């Protein structure tokens, strides 16, 4: 690695990953926390070109090398051979989009940076699979059923300690990028307390209970759905315009006002804060990823009309403090 004596810092940044990290620092302009993180890992996922890796290939990779001892220490040699074989297979399938040496170096260096800050060349294989499957591009329900099955025993049961390990391994990623404090920091215990309060202090937690628990935007996990949501709104074209920068049409997200008529703003105009004189941005908004339908438009019209007669500032939120869960679209 690299040693900086003047700052006394140990760095494992790949030069390509160094360029990626500089780009992330430049794109830090988003004032919002988890939206900025979602954009950042989207940049990283597109950069290391694993989005074209399928989930079934991930199952084949994990079950091919017989890696089922979750507590077994992992050495550099085994992971490099497995990862090289996987990217060689990907190049066999994606010859025009896969560079095996660069890809394996990027993946190994990424994992080394995130999970092995202790400079030991060893990391729990459970953390490895959780990270590589969180970065993996796939659907949603399959992801949760897979990681629950991975953590649960043959009976499909997961105790408090297991979910604590998963919580820690999950928050490891925001810790790498120095924004874990927004999701509550390294303290995973409050998440366990909330999950047990939901489950009325049940002795054990099953798959369906965990599904229902996370389907209500848990504070520490917001970076899983939002990420996918961003992945669902990178090629969406709306039939509208941005009232600030005169974009036509909006590509990507769409944001609609509620206490105004014929007001819409693009994603960049929203995160950056192009403050046009006359109207502020501290009012309730509505977020749209997919192109809208007529029913949604008329319902928004009705909501605006109803709000027009519910004035006098019943509820106000001037500071940001974290305004991530704007509104649910229910796909």
């Amino acid at each position: 690695y690299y040693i900086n004596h003047e700052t006394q810092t140990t760095c494992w940044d790949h030069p390509k990953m160094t360029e990626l990290y500089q780009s992330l620092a430049d794109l830090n302009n988003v004032r919002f926390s988890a939206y900025r993180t979602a954009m950042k890992l989207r940049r990283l996922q597109k950069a290391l070109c694993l989005d074209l890796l399928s989930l079934s290939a991930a199952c084949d990779a994990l079950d091919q090398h017989n890696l089922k001892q979750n507590d077994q220490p992992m050495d550099i040699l085994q992971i490099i051979n497995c990862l090289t074989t996987i990217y060689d297979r990907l190049e066999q399938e994606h010859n025009n989009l896969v560079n095996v040496p660069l890809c394996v170096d990027m993946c190994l260096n990424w994992l080394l940076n995130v999970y092995d800050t202790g400079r030991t060349g060893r990391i729990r294989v459970l953390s490895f699979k959780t990270g590589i499957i969180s970065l993996c591009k796939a659907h949603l329900e399959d992801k949760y059923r897979y990681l629950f099955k991975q953590v649960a025993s043959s009976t499909g049961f997961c105790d408090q300690r297991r979910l604590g390990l998963l919580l820690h391994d999950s928050i490891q990623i925001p810790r790498q990028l120095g924004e874990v404090a927004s999701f509550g920091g390294s303290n995973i215990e409050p998440s366990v307390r909330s999950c047990f309060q939901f489950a009325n202090n049940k002795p054990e937690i099953e798959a369906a209970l965990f599904l229902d628990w996370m389907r209500l935007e848990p504070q520490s996990m917001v970076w899983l759905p939002v990420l996918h949501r961003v992945a669902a709104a990178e090629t969406a074209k709306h039939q509208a315009k941005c009232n600030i920068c005169k974009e036509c049409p909006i590509i990507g997200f769409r944001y609609r006002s509620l206490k105004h008529f014929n007001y819409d703003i693009c994603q960049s105009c929203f995160f950056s804060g192009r403050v046009a004189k006359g109207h502020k941005m501290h009012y309730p908004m509505v977020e749209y990823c997919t192109p809208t339908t007529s029913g949604e438009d008329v319902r928004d019209f009705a909501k605006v009309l109803k709000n027009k007669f519910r004035t006098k500032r019943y509820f106000a939120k001037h500071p940001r403090m974290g305004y991530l869960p704007v509104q649910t679209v229910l796909e």
Partner: protein, 206 residues
């Protein structure tokens, strides 16, 4: 005014070191990462541990800081370490107390004043949720020692009766009562100095 001069000096120092840009949440996260939060406040630490904690805090602050304005991480870290050494160890012993470091971090961290007051009250509060009068006196003494480094110690000297001027010794200190005392117009010396420092920082920033 001497209090006004001290508040202006503190605001200028915070602006130069960007201390107001670091929230207390980053501070507690760094302390948990360094395991100093679980450590006893009476346990001292070497200069290496404090330097590592400051460097980690600066690194996590800058990682989310846009490249639009590059920050001299090394120079800022050196200045912060020198200021902490001057405020906590005038004799240059090289050892920094955990309680003094925590109090200084809470004071210098920017964010909502109510949140900082609640955090300070929770830290002062014992396992039963009641603040300790001895803890309040120790905090006042540490604050007075810190104000001496800004060449304004006479206006904020170490007085044991100052806590008696804030709240009654025979009356329990609650979060609501502490917030009311701190936010009141006739605030005590420490509460007035905190509001004065906040006003000076707000004026300097805007």
């Amino acid at each position: 005014l001497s209090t006004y001069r001290t508040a202006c000096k503190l605001r200028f120092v915070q602006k130069k070191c960007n201390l107001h840009l670091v929230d207390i949440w980053n501070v507690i996260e760094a302390l948990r990462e360094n395991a100093l939060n679980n450590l006893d406040p009476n346990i001292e630490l070497n200069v290496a541990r404090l330097e590592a904690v400051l460097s980690t805090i600066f690194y996590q602050l800058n990682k989310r800081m846009p490249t639009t304005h590059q920050i001299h991480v090394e120079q800022s870290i050196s200045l912060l370490l020198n200021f902490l050494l001057a405020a906590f160890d005038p004799e240059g012993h090289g050892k920094i107390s955990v309680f003094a470091v925590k109090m200084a971090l809470a004071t210098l961290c920017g964010g909502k004043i109510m949140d900082k007051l609640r955090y300070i009250f929770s830290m002062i509060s014992d396992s039963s949720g009641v603040m300790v009068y001895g803890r309040y006196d120790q905090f006042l003494r540490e604050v007075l020692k810190l104000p001496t480094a800004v060449f304004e110690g006479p206006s904020f000297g170490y007085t044991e009766q100052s806590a008696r001027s804030c709240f009654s010794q025979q009356k329990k200190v609650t979060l609501n009562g502490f917030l009311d005392t701190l936010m009141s117009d006739p605030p005590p010396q420490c509460l007035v100095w905190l509001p004065l420092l906040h006003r000076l920082a707000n004026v300097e920033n805007v």
